[PDB]
C-alpha cells in the first residue's frame, strides 16, 4: 500500500520497479508509482532514452520512511529523497492519486516472483554493501566496481561484497592445501558461514542482491560475485541439506526471471557447466538443472 511519488518527469526515460518497467515521455504528466507491496525491499531504476549509458537506481523499503523521486537538472539524474514531514507527504500522494497521475505496481495475486527473488534480502544488509549512511535508501548503477575489482579506484562509490578468492590464504589452511582446494567445505562452512555471514540466510541475501544488481543494472562485478557464491557452495562436498534445497529454489527463480535475450552476457558457461555436471552438488539442484536444460541448452 506504499507510494513513491515523482515531482515530475522532465526527460524521456524507461522506469523499472522491481521486475516491471514502462516508458515515460519527456514532460509526460507522470507523478509516480502506488500500491507497492509492504514487506519486501524494492528497486526503482532508470535508463534514459537519449543515453542508455545512464543506468542506475535505488534500493528502498517503504517501512523505513517516505521516499520520492525528483529530477536534478545539474547532475542529470532522477534522485531519491526522503520527505521527513509526514502530513506534507500524505497531502502530495493524496492529490496525485485523486488526479490518477500514478502507475499501479502490477502484482498478480498468484505471483510470488518478487518474494522468491528477495526472500533473504534485507535493507539493513544492503546499506553495508552500499555505504551512504545519511540516506535510508541505496544508489547502484551499471559502472560501480566491487572492492574485489578495485584490488585487481574511488572507495566511497564501491560495492562492498564479501571477497571470495579460491587461491587466497583465507580459502586454504596451511597443511590442507589439496584438501581445501579440491573440497571448499572449510571455506564455505567455517570461514564464510560461521565466520563472516553468521548464517545461511545472510549468505543467500548477498547472493540474491548480487544477482539483482547484475540483472537490473548490467553490473559486471555483481555478476562475478553471484557466480562466486554459487561456485563456493557447488564446490563444497559438505553442505547442509536445507541450504542445498534452498539454493535450488533461489537459482530456479533467478533463471526463470532472466530475460532470454541477456543469457549470453549474464551467465558464465564454465561456472554453470561445472556446477550442474562436474561439482560435488551436480545431483543436488534438480529444479535449476531442469529449467537451465530447457531454457538455455546452448550455454550447456
Amino acid at each position: 500500500m506504499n507510494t513513491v511519488p515523482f515531482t515530475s518527469a522532465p526527460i524521456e526515460v524507461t522506469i523499472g520497479i522491481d521486475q516491471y518497467s514502462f516508458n515515460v515521455k519527456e514532460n509526460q504528466p507522470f507523478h509516480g508509482i502506488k500500491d507497492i507491496p509492504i514487506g519486501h525491499v524494492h528497486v526503482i531504476h532508470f535508463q534514459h532514452a537519449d543515453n542508455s549509458s545512464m543506468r542506475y537506481g535505488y534500493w528502498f523499503d517503504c517501512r523505513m520512511g517516505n521516499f520520492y523521486i525528483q529530477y536534478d537538472p545539474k547532475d542529470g539524474l532522477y534522485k531519491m529523497m526522503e520527505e521527513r514531514d509526514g502530513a506534507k507527504f500524505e497531502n502530495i500522494v493524496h492529490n496525485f492519486k485523486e488526479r490518477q497521475m500514478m502507475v499501479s505496481y502490477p502484482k498478480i495475486d498468484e505471483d510470488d516472483t518478487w518474494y522468491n527473488l528477495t526472500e533473504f534480502v534485507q535493507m539493513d544488509k544492503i546499506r553495508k554493501i552500499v555505504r551512504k549512511d545519511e540516506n535510508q535508501f541505496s544508489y547502484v548503477d551499471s559502472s560501480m566496481t566491487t572492492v574485489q575489482e578495485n584490488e585487481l579506484s574511488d572507495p566511497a562509490h564501491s560495492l562492498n561484497y564479501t571477497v571470495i578468492n579460491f587461491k587466497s590464504r583465507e580459502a586454504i589452511r596451511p597443511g590442507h592445501e589439496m584438501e581445501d582446494f579440491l573440497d571448499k567445505s572449510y571455506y564455505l562452512n567455517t570461514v564464510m558461514l560461521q565466520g563472516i555471514f553468521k548464517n545461511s540466510s545472510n549468505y543467500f541475501g548477498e547472493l540474491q542482491f548480487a544477482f539483482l544488481n547484475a540483472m537490473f543494472f548490467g553490473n559486471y562485478g555483481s555478476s562475478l560475485q553471484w557466480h562466486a557464491m554459487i561456485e563456493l557452495i557447488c564446490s563444497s562436498a559438505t553442505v547442509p541439506k536445507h541450504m542445498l534445497d534452498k539454493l535450488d529454489e533461489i537459482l530456479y527463480y533467478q533463471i526463470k526471471t532472466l530475460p532470454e535475450q541477456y543469457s549470453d552476457i549474464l551467465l558464465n558457461e564454465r561456472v554453470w557447466n561445472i556446477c550442474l555436471y562436474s561439482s560435488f552438488q551436480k545431483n543436488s539442484l534438480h529444479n535449476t538443472e531442469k529449467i537451465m536444460e530447457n531454457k538455455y541448452p546452448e550455454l550447456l
Partner: protein
Amino acid sequence: GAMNSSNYAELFNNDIKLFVDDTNVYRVTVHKTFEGNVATKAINGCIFTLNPKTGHLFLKIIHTSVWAGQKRLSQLAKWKTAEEVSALVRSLPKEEQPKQIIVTRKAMLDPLEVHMLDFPNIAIRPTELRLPFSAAMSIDKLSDVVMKATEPQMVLFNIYDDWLDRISSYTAFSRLTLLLRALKTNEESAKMILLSDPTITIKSYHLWPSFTDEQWITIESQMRDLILTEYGRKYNVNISALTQTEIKDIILGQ
C-alpha cells in the same frame, strides 16, 4: 607470463629460477592379476628441480611408501610435487630462494600456486618449450639413486658436471637438452654414442663422460643425427633428401 623461444635468454640471467618437472614422480608398471584383471605396481620416482643457470639439480626421490593407501594417485602426485617444492623453497636461505618457478606441465600451476601462497613475490609460470626432462631417468647415476632408495631422500647434483668452467650456461643448457632429447628419442643409440669409446670415462663425481671440447662437438653432431635418423624412421621420411633449413627446424621445432 609463459616462457617461450622469444624470452629464452631469461633462463640465463641473474634472477634465481628453477624448472620443476613432475613426469617421473608417479611411475608404475601395468600387469595382469591371477583373475585376468589389470593392476598397477608403483616404483620409486623423483621430482626434477633444476637451476638452468648453475646446473644445480634438487632430485627429490619419491619412495613408493608415499602412495600407500592413497586414492587418485595421478592427482595426488601433482600436490605432493607442489608440497615438496614449497618445502625446498622454505629450506633455502632467503638470498637463495627462486624469484620464478617454471613448471614443465600446466597441470602443476594450481597445485604449486596454492602451496606457495606464503611467497606472493615468487612467480609461478608455465612454458611453451617442450623440454625433455622426462628422460632424466636415462642418466644411469640418477636412475640408480632413485631405484636403490628405501625411504624419502633429497640428492643434490650438478647436471652440467664441470662444463661451466669452459662454456656459458646458455651452451650448457643446449648440450643438456640435446643429450636428454636424444636419450628420450632412442635411449639405446644415445647411450652407445656416449659410452662406446672406453678411453673416455665418467669421473666418480660426474654424470656424463669427460669429453674434450673437440669430442663434445662430435658427440653433439652424432646426437643431432640420431634425432634426425629417428624422425625419418617415425614419419617414413627420406632424411638424405632434406636441406639444412629443413634439418634446422626439426632440431628445435620438436
